[PDB]
Amino acid sequence: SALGKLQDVVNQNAQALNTLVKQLSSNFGAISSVLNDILSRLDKVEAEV
Amino acid sequence: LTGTGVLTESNKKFLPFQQFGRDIADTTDAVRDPQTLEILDITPCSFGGV
Amino acid sequence: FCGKGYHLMSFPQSAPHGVVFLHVTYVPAQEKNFTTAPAICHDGKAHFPREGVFVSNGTHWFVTQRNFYEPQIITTDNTFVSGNCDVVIGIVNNTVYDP
Amino acid sequence: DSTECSNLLLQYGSFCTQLNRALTGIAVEQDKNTQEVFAQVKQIYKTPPIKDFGGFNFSQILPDPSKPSKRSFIEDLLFNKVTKFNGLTVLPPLLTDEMIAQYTSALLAGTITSGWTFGAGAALQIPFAMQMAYRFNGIGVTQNVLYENQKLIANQFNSAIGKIQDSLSSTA
Amino acid sequence: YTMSLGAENSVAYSNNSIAIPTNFTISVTTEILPVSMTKTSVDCTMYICG
Numbered sequence: 563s564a565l566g567k568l569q570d571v572v573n574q575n576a577q578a579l580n581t582l583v584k585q586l587s588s589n590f591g592a593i594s595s596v597l598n599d600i601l602s603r604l605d606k607v608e609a610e611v
Numbered sequence: 612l613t614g615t616g617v618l619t620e621s622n623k624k625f626l627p628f629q630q631f632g633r634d635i636a637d638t639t640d641a642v643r644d645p646q647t648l649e650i651l652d653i654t655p656c657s658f659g660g661v
Numbered sequence: 662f663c664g665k666g667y668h669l670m671s672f673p674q675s676a677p678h679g680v681v682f683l684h685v686t687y688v689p690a691q692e693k694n695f696t697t698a699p700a701i702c703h704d705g706k707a708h709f710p711r712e713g714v715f716v717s718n719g720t721h722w723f724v725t726q727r728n729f730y731e732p733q734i735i736t737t738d739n740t741f742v743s744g745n746c747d748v749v750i751g752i753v754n755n756t757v758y759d760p
Numbered sequence: 761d762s763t764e765c766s767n768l769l770l771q772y773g774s775f776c777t778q779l780n781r782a783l784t785g786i787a788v789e790q791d792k793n794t795q796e797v798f799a800q801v802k803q804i805y806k807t808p809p810i811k812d813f814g815g816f817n818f819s820q821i822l823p824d825p826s827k828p829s830k831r832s833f834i835e836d837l838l839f840n841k842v843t844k845f846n847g848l849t850v851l852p853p854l855l856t857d858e859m860i861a862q863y864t865s866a867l868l869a870g871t872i873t874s875g876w877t878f879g880a881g882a883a884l885q886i887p888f889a890m891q892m893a894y895r896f897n898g899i900g901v902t903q904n905v906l907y908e909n910q911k912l913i914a915n916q917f918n919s920a921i922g923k924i925q926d927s928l929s930s931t932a
Numbered sequence: 933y934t935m936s937l938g939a940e941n942s943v944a945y946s947n948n949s950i951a952i953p954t955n956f957t958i959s960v961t962t963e964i965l966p967v968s969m970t971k972t973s974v975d976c977t978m979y980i981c982g
């Protein structure tokens with residue numbers, strides 16, 4: 563626990579990127595999370611939204 | 612599956628029922644060839660700043 | 662600021678994404694009780710310490726530094742004259758050695 | 761108070777989780793800041809029952825056991841001037857007002873009974889007159905100026921404390 | 933339990949008493965302070981439209 567002040571900073575910097583990558587795989591109200599699975603599944607007008 | 616990456620020979624010994632592996636943060640990093648039943652990782656292609 | 666106590670010196674040390682300082686401090690450990698006085702009356706005049714404070718071990722009076730015990734004889738080279746001996750509160754009587 | 765709303769919100773990732781984590785971090789940061797500001801000594805020093813501080817009157821800044829809250833007059837004047845259904849919760853602080861008052865009283869007693877030696881190590885007792893003499897020698901004034909004008913300085917300090925109390929009790 | 937703020941030390945204060953130390957202990961204390969953090973240049977375009 564001597565270098566906890568640096569360990570906390572490293573852990574926060576890692577958790578930020580982890581949360582960002584995890585939110586990359588979210589839906590946000592769309593029909594799916596994969597971009598290609600939404601592109602090559604419907605027409606252009608229905609996929610633009 | 613789908614994606615873009617450079618494959619390579621892998622050393623990860625999968626299980627007889629597992630097909631594709633994912634590392635932390637839920638990202639596909641290793642897949643199995645369905646024909647020859649070999650394991651090969653999929654690293655992302657080189658990208659950076661100029 | 663530079664550690665707890667009277668800072669003497671510090672040594673920097675490298676650390677991953679940071680820096681580590683080794684502060685060397687001066688901390689007193691063993692102290693003793695002493696009877697003190699603001700000044701001394703010798704020949705009607707008051708004698709105040711230049712760099713130190715008056716202490717008494719029960720019978721004799723000495724002048725020593727504030728952060729260490731080093732008793733010395735109350736001489737003219739250690740105490741200066743200022744005013745008289747009728748206004749200082751708590752003043753006492755003691756001889757002042759003249760070299 | 762909704763079920764379908766939660767199912768719709770679960771598709772937005774972990775925003776609620778990171779917001780709660782940020783709020784908890786802010787709370788822990790405030791607690792640590794209060795502790796680092798006030799909790800700086802390891803022993804709670806108490807002023808002696810005698811008030812022979814060389815004419816200086818500290819009764820207006822020291823705690824009074826007559827009142828329930830162990831706070832002084834200035835602290836009472838300061839505390840008498842500062843004035844749900846959706847998730848808004850206010851967590852109580854770790855160190856209450858009584859503990860902050862005890863820390864302040866310990867700091868004040870250490871300052872008036874030991875000068876500055878209680879910070880670098882053990883509390884070394886020293887008369888307040890000689891402490892003021894050390895202060896004057898530090899600011900560049902000979903200690904004979906204090907030892908020959910102690911009553912005047914004590915009266916000026918008492919008048920200044922009284923004026924500070926009057927100003928804190930009059931305006932806001 | 934209600935946390936205690938430390939011990940209770942009553943300094944023997946009087947108008948004719950002084951405590952002058954007779955010894956000393958040279959102590960060395962460490963202090964860790966962050967300086968920098970890991971650089972992270974996230975591609976603003978590839979993250980959303982890989």
Ligand SMILES: *[C@@H]1O[C@H](CO)[C@@H](O[C@@H]2O[C@H](CO)[C@@H](O[C@@H]3O[C@H](CO)[C@@H](O)[C@H](O)[C@@H]3O)[C@H](O)[C@H]2NC(C)=O)[C@H](O)[C@H]1NC(C)=O
Nearest residue numbers: 688689690691692693729730731953954955956957958959
């Ligand atoms: C100020 O404090 C220091 C540190 O506590 C004192 O130094 C210590 O003095 C004692 C007394 O001589 C030493 O004990 C001796 O240890 C040897 C073995 O090393 C033993 O053979 C002797 O019979 C005796 O017990 C002690 O080692 C020493 N500590 C250090 C770190 O050197 C010092 O004496 C104190 N000053 C005064 C004026 O009291």
Ligand SMILES: *[C@@H]1O[C@H](CO)[C@@H](O[C@@H]2O[C@H](CO)[C@@H](O)[C@H](O)[C@H]2NC(C)=O)[C@H](O)[C@H]1NC(C)=O
Nearest residue numbers: 626627628629630643644645646647648649650
């Ligand atoms: C799919 O077919 C290929 C050949 O078309 C099979 O590969 C052969 O597998 C046998 C058994 O291990 C080997 O002895 C041959 O040398 C392989 N030939 C080649 C060209 O690789 C493969 O095993 C078949 N996979 C499945 C699941 O039936």
Ligand SMILES: *[C@@H]1O[C@H](CO)[C@@H](O[C@@H]2O[C@H](CO)[C@@H](O)[C@H](O)[C@H]2NC(C)=O)[C@H](O)[C@H]1NC(C)=O
Nearest residue numbers: 695716717718719720721722723724732733734
């Ligand atoms: C206070 O300090 C003085 C100065 O050292 C002490 O006087 C000495 O006492 C020793 C012990 O008997 C004698 O051998 C010396 O001859 C004395 N010197 C002088 C100049 O008088 C005195 O004893 C100390 N008093 C106490 C109570 O500790």
Ligand SMILES: *[C@@H]1O[C@H](CO)[C@@H](O[C@@H]2O[C@H](CO)[C@@H](O)[C@H](O)[C@H]2NC(C)=O)[C@H](O)[C@H]1NC(C)=O
Nearest residue numbers: 749750751752753810811812813814946947948
């Ligand atoms: C230091 O404080 C003590 C304690 O208040 C003073 O002793 C008092 O002296 C007066 C006058 O001689 C007496 O009437 C009291 O009865 C004493 N009180 C006690 C408890 O003994 C002493 O005079 C003070 N000394 C200085 C220099 O201020």
Ligand SMILES: *[C@@H]1O[C@H](CO)[C@@H](O[C@@H]2O[C@H](CO)[C@@H](O)[C@H](O)[C@H]2NC(C)=O)[C@H](O)[C@H]1NC(C)=O
Nearest residue numbers: 701702703704705746747751752753754755756
């Ligand atoms: C220090 O010495 C002076 C002078 O020897 C003392 O002053 C005397 O005090 C007595 C009693 O108050 C008077 O009767 C004398 O007339 C004073 N003499 C002078 C010359 O003023 C003084 O009391 C001594 N101080 C102490 C603390 O003993």
Ligand SMILES: *[C@@H]1O[C@H](CO)[C@@H](O[C@@H]2O[C@H](CO)[C@@H](O)[C@H](O)[C@H]2NC(C)=O)[C@H](O)[C@H]1NC(C)=O
Nearest residue numbers: 810811812813815816817818819820918921922
């Ligand atoms: C410090 O100041 C306070 C406030 O002036 C003093 O309290 C007064 O004490 C006298 C004498 O007992 C009373 O007649 C007043 O009514 C008190 N005033 C208040 C507002 O309480 C206190 O005595 C002073 N301290 C010392 C040691 O004299």
Ligand SMILES: *[C@@H]1O[C@H](CO)[C@@H](O)[C@H](O)[C@H]1NC(C)=O
Nearest residue numbers: 691692693694695943944951
């Ligand atoms: C000084 O005297 C007081 C009261 O008798 C005592 O509590 C204290 O420990 C003494 N100082 C030392 C260094 O022993």
